[PDB]
Amino acid sequence: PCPQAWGPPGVQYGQPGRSVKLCCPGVTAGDPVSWFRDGEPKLLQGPDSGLGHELVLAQADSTDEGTYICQTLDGALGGTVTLQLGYPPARPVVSCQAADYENFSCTWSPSQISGLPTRYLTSYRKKTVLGADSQRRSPSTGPWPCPQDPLGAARCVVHGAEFWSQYRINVTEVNPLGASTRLLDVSLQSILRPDPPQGLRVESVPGYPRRLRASWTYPASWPSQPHFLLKFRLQYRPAQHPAWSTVEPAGLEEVITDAVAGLPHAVRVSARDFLDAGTWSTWSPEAWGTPSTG
Amino acid sequence: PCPQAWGPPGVQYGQPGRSVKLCCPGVTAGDPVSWFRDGEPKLLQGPDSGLGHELVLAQADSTDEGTYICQTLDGALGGTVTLQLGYPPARPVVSCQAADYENFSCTWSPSQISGLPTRYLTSYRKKTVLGADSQRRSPSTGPWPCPQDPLGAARCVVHGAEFWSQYRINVTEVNPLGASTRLLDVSLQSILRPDPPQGLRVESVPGYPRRLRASWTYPASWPSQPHFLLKFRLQYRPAQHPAWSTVEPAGLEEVITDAVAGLPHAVRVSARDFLDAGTWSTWSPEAWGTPSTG
Amino acid sequence: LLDPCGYISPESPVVQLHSNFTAVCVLKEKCMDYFHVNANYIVWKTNHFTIPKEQYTIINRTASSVTFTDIASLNIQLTCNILTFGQLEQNVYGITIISGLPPEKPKNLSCIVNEGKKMRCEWDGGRETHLETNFTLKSEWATHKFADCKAKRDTPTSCTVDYSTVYFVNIEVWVEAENALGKVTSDHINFDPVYKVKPNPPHNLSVINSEELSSILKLTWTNPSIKSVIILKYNIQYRTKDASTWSQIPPEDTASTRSSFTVQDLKPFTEYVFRIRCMKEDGKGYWSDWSEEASGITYEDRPSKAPSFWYKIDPSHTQGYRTVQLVWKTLPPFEANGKILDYEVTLTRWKSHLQNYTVNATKLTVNLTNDRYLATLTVRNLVGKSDAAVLTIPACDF
Amino acid sequence: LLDPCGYISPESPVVQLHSNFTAVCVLKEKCMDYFHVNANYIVWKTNHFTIPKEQYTIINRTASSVTFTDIASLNIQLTCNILTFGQLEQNVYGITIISGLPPEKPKNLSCIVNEGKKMRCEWDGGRETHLETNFTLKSEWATHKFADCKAKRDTPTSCTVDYSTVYFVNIEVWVEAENALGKVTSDHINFDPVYKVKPNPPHNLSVINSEELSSILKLTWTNPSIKSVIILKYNIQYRTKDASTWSQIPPEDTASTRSSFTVQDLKPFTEYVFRIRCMKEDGKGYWSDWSEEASGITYEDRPSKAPSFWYKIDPSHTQGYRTVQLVWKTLPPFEANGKILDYEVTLTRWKSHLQNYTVNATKLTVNLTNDRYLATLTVRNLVGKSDAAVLTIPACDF
Amino acid sequence: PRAELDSTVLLTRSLLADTRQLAAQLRDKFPADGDHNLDSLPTLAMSAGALGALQLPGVLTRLRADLLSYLRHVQWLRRAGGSSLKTLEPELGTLQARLDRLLRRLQLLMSRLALPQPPPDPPAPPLAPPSSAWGGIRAAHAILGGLHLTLDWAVRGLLLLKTRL
Amino acid sequence: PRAELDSTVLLTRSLLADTRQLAAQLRDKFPADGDHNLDSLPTLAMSAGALGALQLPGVLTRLRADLLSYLRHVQWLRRAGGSSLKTLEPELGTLQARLDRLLRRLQLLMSRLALPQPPPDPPAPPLAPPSSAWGGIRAAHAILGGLHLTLDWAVRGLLLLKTRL
Ligand SMILES: *[C@@H]1O[C@H](CO)[C@@H](O[C@@H]2O[C@H](CO)[C@@H](O[C@@H]3O[C@H](CO)[C@@H](O)[C@H](O)[C@@H]3O)[C@H](O)[C@H]2NC(C)=O)[C@H](O)[C@H]1NC(C)=O
Ligand SMILES: *[C@@H]1O[C@H](CO)[C@@H](O[C@@H]2O[C@H](CO)[C@@H](O[C@@H]3O[C@H](CO)[C@@H](O)[C@H](O)[C@@H]3O)[C@H](O)[C@H]2NC(C)=O)[C@H](O)[C@H]1NC(C)=O
Ligand SMILES: *[C@@H]1O[C@H](CO)[C@@H](O[C@@H]2O[C@H](CO)[C@@H](O)[C@H](O)[C@H]2NC(C)=O)[C@H](O)[C@H]1NC(C)=O
Ligand SMILES: *[C@@H]1O[C@H](CO)[C@@H](O[C@@H]2O[C@H](CO)[C@@H](O)[C@H](O)[C@H]2NC(C)=O)[C@H](O)[C@H]1NC(C)=O
Ligand SMILES: *[C@@H]1O[C@H](CO)[C@@H](O)[C@H](O)[C@H]1NC(C)=O
Ligand SMILES: *[C@@H]1O[C@H](CO)[C@@H](O)[C@H](O)[C@H]1NC(C)=O
Ligand SMILES: *[C@@H]1O[C@H](CO)[C@@H](O)[C@H](O)[C@H]1NC(C)=O
Ligand SMILES: *[C@@H]1O[C@H](CO)[C@@H](O)[C@H](O)[C@H]1NC(C)=O
């Protein structure tokens, strides 16, 4: 009767400078047993007289890392344990994003690896406003799992998320010794950022030496829908000039009217929900065009 | 028994075009008597059969003016009457004035004489404010006589008048046939006008070619008293110039400061109660002076 | 006797100019008995002027009346008096007669919504009435009446509502003029306040050059907050620092919301001042005031032709040499194309090595031999050197 | 959990710049139990800036505090937060810290009674305090307190009482400055309002000449109504229509109430403009503004000397006669003494009858014989003729 | 003499001038013809025959009673008066602010001169409001006309005091 | 479509922009950190998963109930609010004058579209005044923060109606 293992069935873990308490796996509780370090014959001692069912180490230093053997005083090999040293987990770093009104996604990286089997528990809840306690769960606003599809990708997925509610995501890094939960407040309406438009093209307009026509499409991750349009902001700049000029086109087209005649112009655009929800997208790839002559 | 006479004891009066009713003085009432015009024997008649105690004339015209004789039918001379013709009195014209705070005085002239013994009744009363009726006379605010000292001078005199109260003076012209009362409202504080100062003298002021000193005294009818001062207004004018200049001196002296050098100046002054009661006096006699040379 | 006896009727009438007015004075029985008088003894006075006896009309033994025709005085003050005891006038009653015209229907009514301020409306008042006339701006929906707007004494032809403007909803507005002599309403108008906005002019105007070419200047500014409700349009005007009149960019080129603009076709090294105004793209409303002026200077560029170039020659003080005075004229500003930094002179003798001299002046004295020389002159600015003027100066025996 | 838990003390303090301020944040028991935190977990922020951890001081397990020294920011916004579940800040309470200086004792306090208007007082405010400061004009008799005068937001250094001025009674007046950080009163002054009156300037100014002499002009005007309470004094200034500066009559000559004044020693035919101001004879108060300007013209007078006079002579076209051109110069304005109406020339031959010719010009052509003549010239205006210039023109054989 | 006594006579002359000007302007604008009366004003039963003879408490007592009646009446005009008389402001209000002020100052005067103070008399009940605007105009004439007599005798009475104190 | 439906969505977008700007300026001036709550605001239980599916009365009914609660709360801030928030006028009052106006217009909208009107619900009792000025500031954040979500879904809801009527 000892703590069931963490990973493999006969290995236990500990942190340096702390206390670690090893048990002999295959020995009846109450039988006295002896402990040795691999390759070194000195009999180790312990606060419990010196012969119990469980070895204790107040040392926990690097010299204590290796393979251990336990045997009963009769000589019978009662089992083997491996001591791997490490450190408690650091707090993970979490960011989220969302390119549609249904799902959003968050990612995380360890701030420290420790050398320990650092697996992750991920969950999130919908905060309410009554606030009598943390228990208002008839629809069960508790912890909901973020399934990891090929059990990596380092990202939670939310299907069927509430667009306007605010969520507190609970990412907990865990190792065999504790937790350091990261909590991140996220509202879909504040965090949202669409991808940039694709296929930006600029064309001359015959007859007008200082107008250019820019066209582009929605991003593919954003389905065109009458409820959430997007506003756009277009920028243009003549070659060698340092400062961008900004316009806010209606729709998927924009006639630029102050282009310098006969000069290449760079153009880039970004997108945001038309009701100023979330934040502006990253800038599009630069596109170049040249006004017609005459 | 006939109306007692007006003036002399056996003469009666009448107006042309009216009706006049003569009586025989020395005949017992009830004795028939005859009437004749002087020098003309025709027996005159009358509505009362033709022989009463009283002659009546509906005629009243100019031919009826003269001396009349009445006699009883026996021949006895019962008396003589003289018919003098005239007209009702016209309304008299009344004005008042006052040079002191105690007494004021009013005068009147007939607007028509009529040829009749036009004597005058004069009186005045102090109007009150309760106004229940014309009877509030415990101090007896009724009619008070204006005694005529040598029984002429055409003026009422008020001794011990109330300075601030308002008075309605009642001048009634009367002849043997009626009245035409003149009523004149008068308040001592509004009507008052002092006499002009006397002895106005102007003197040069050596060293100052454009200053003159004017001096004068109170009028003799105005006793100097600390309760009612007078303000003064002085006027000066260079010879041949058309417009007067006015200053308002304090006291009985005034230094003129804009006199034209080397030119005769006319000066006149008038007086009023220092609290702007009543009205300004008439202008003083003109006085001349000439600024010193240099 | 006490208290005002009798009365004048009507109490305090107001009539229209050129109309008729009849006034009646009636005496109370107590006053009539006391003074032993009647209507025939009543005399009328106005503003200290005696009404001629021929104008009275006795309506009954208790009351007298007068009738004024074609009334032309603005403020007849009427008083009724009795001649009582005779040759004495006492006040019975009095009234004030006011005259004028009814208010005309307000026309050319217009409103404006200055961004950040509440709606203000203006209207044309008609003929002067000489009476205190109230103006109230009325506004109501088919299902609701809004708070009345009372014009100010100082500004009787304008009113400013007390409720904040609400765009995108049609509001029915009209003004109601009323005074003691009459009530009338102007015609009703219907509009969406969004089409009567007068935005403020752009601010934070900055002029910035571009070190590429010399005929472009970039304009930047901050649009007015009102851009959240309407799309802005602009008018950009420009002229040279010495020009007397303004030119204008084609409206079509500045027909939509923007926060910057690149002006082209500008003269080299000329200072320009700019000013802008903006309004809703559709033209419905009144134009805003002009923005603050902004100044800027174009970049450098080089002379477009070589300068005129000549010389004068005199004998030198050194035997065998000639003193040659080269002289030239400062390029005209439109040809100089900028600040002159310096000059470069070159001198090349036939089949010999070139000599160059930098000169910061318009004359140079040099000692030359008696041989023939080629002389050139270029002027240099930040961008480069002009083409050279070249002359042959012949030998002295030519 | 619900409702703001705990509190910040003091509620809303105001402190003086460069002073010390200690703030205490205390957590309610319910919040402390729920989050499993205490004072050591409290973090302080101001205007989005994190207060350095080294500045906190835990006073008890329930409350944390910070102490600011030499406070230099005008509007510290203070907020108290808990780090709850860890790495999460939640708002507990908040307060606004305002700082400044107490008001200085107002000095150079002065009042003025403009005729027809109520008393107005002015005072010098001291250092800027950056806080809303109220100014109240206080006035009271030993047996009575008058209505307070509240300064206007726009004019915090001036106030205008709501009671009409009552002259000839001493009134005690002072201003009280008070704000959230302190109360102080200015020094008390005592005066009779009659000595602080600022009358309006004279109006209805008229300039009238006198057809007697040419060096006198009579000034008339209407004094201000305030003459019923105080005796007026005046200052009369005058200059020529072309002069650049004003002259002034000796104050002693205009030291008492008057409604007219005769100016002497004026230059002939010169146009003069006048302006006047007035005040109480004793000089106690402030001078009124200048009256409206008035213009006038002096009367006619005659030339003070004969003009310069000469001639030119040439042969005539008529045998036996000589053409003599008499010429003269227009008198200088100061010598002309007015509008030239016309000229008179006389010619007298030795022992013959005088001939006279009126001429409206500066030249005359006459046909004279070969004998000697005496010629004279006078100029005439409304008043008379000048003395004559006389010359002998000798015979041609002289 | 004394400065306090000089000042009170001077202010009455100032108020007298203000009252005369407003009374003449008012009749100029609303020419009432005839003698107008109100039952509440006092009868000014003083012939100026002999006024030095009268002693100090009576001169001051009579002025206080008369001026208090006039003050109520001035106040009465402002509160319940007809719109016809709005043209008399602000001139009527300055007079109110001045006459009330002078009456109060007189009570202070009485204390400093140690004169016996009269017993608190029972104030007269309120005057009914005017029945019409013109009744109010006639009332205005009575107050200003009646006032420019009380003040004239006030100047006189204070001057009598001045010759002694 | 219809002009009345176009106009209401446009005004909500105008009001939404006004609410966002005032909410960001207010937190900029009074940096509250942490999620603030009030028991009286409604829970906006809508995932935007499927919103076309919902029928016409419910979309309009939910907006009316939420907006009426927000209106009372805006009014509550003005009346009993602490002096600390006087800096939010006149911007807060224009929003009040605009949100109240839009709520009223919606009732007119309901009549013209013949939608069933909800039964007169019992109004919620009054909110106690804030215990302090900063409690009022936290309340201001909740109303403006809570409003700029209701209005966002209002634009969305009206746009759903627009695709049909
Ligand atoms: C975020 O998530 C983590 C884990 O998903 C939460 O940590 C868990 O918190 C509970 C209570 O605070 C710990 O107690 C456990 O309770 C259960 C049920 O009574 C009991 O059977 C266990 O023996 C244990 O006592 C639990 O150890 C802890 N860790 C876990 C579950 O791995 C954390 O509370 C969450 N943070 C939030 C919701 O803010
Ligand atoms: C102004 O004075 C005249 C005379 O002084 C007044 O005239 C008199 O008025 C009375 C009544 O109006 C007349 O009646 C007389 O009354 C007495 C007393 O009852 C009686 O005995 C007489 O027989 C007569 O009926 C009187 O004839 C008349 N004339 C006189 C007295 O000569 C006039 O009333 C005064 N006006 C006023 C006060 O306004
Ligand atoms: C004499 O005639 C006049 C006509 O104006 C009468 O005055 C009117 O009398 C009626 C009677 O009911 C009143 O209703 C009117 O109001 C009176 N006119 C005015 C202007 O008020 C007067 O009553 C007549 N005399 C008598 C004794 O009846
Ligand atoms: C811990 O110490 C703090 C010191 O600030 C205590 O807070 C004060 O407690 C007293 C107790 O009567 C109150 O009167 C004061 O008003 C408190 N301070 C403030 C700023 O309000 C606190 O009470 C102590 N803890 C306990 C449990 O008593
Ligand atoms: C009344 O008005 C009419 C016009 O309507 C005019 O002819 C007449 O002269 C006026 N006066 C009268 C009828 O006394
Ligand atoms: C005009 O307005 C004034 C002030 O509100 C009011 O006293 C007057 O009665 C109004 N006039 C009319 C005819 O309503
Ligand atoms: C408090 O004020 C004193 C001066 O009175 C100053 O010396 C000190 O630094 C301030 N701060 C403290 C004591 O924390
Ligand atoms: C200053 O005046 C304002 C307005 O009357 C008032 O609200 C404020 O409380 C006053 N300040 C003080 C310190 O009394």
Numbering used by the authors:
A (entry chain F), B (entry chain C): 3 to 296
C (entry chain D), D (entry chain A): 2 to 399
E (entry chain B), F (entry chain E): 14 to 178
Question: How is this structure described in the published paper?
Answer:
IL-11 activates downstream signalling pathways by binding its two cell surface receptors: the IL-11 specific receptor, IL-11Rα, and the signal-transducing receptor, glycoprotein (gp)13013,26.
D1 of IL-11Rα was not visible in the gp130D1-D3 complex map and was poorly defined in the gp130EC complex map, suggesting this domain is flexible. D5-D6 of gp130 were poorly defined in the gp130EC complex density and were not included in the deposited model. We considered the possibility that structural dynamics of gp130 D4-D6 contributed to the decreasing density quality with distance from the cytokine binding regions. Histograms of the distributions along each trajectory are unimodal, indicating continuous motion. This analysis shows that the D4-D6 region of gp130 is dynamic and is not stabilised upon complex formation. A multistate model, allowing flexibility of gp130 domains D4-D6 and IL-11Rα D1, fit the SAXS data for the gp130EC complex better than our single consensus model of the complex, further supporting flexibility of these domains within the complex. The affinity of the IL-11RαD1-D3/IL-11Δ10 binary complex for gp130EC, (KD 4 ± 2 nM, ΔH -20 ± 1 kJ/mol; Fig. 2Iiii) is very similar to the affinity for gp130D1-D3, indicating that the membrane-proximal (D4-D6) domains of gp130 do not contribute substantially to complex formation. The observation that D4-D6 of gp130 are flexible with respect to the membrane distal domains (D1-D3) provides information on the potential relative positions of the two D6 domains within the complex that may affect positioning of the transmembrane and cytoplasmic domains.
